[PDB]
Amino acid sequence: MVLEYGEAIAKFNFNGDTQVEMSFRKGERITLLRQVDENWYEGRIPGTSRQGIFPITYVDVIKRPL
């Protein structure tokens, strides 16, 4: 359903505890693939296979997915 991916830069360190979650450090640029629910994005690290979900509150949203 998404027509344009978004992007964000991490503003907090996030340790995912499960396979569905994507860990990252402050400063990592993340492509936003979709908003999963009220609290989580699915994203990916550009040029890689790191993909999974993380909390919206842990990133600075530059562009929302459309």
Binding site: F14, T18, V20, D37, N39, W40, T57
Partner: peptide, 10 residues
């Protein structure tokens, strides 16, 4: 130090 982790999606 970070915001509390929200509950996971369904």
């Amino acid at each position: 130090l970070a915001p509390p982790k929200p509950p996971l999606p369904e």
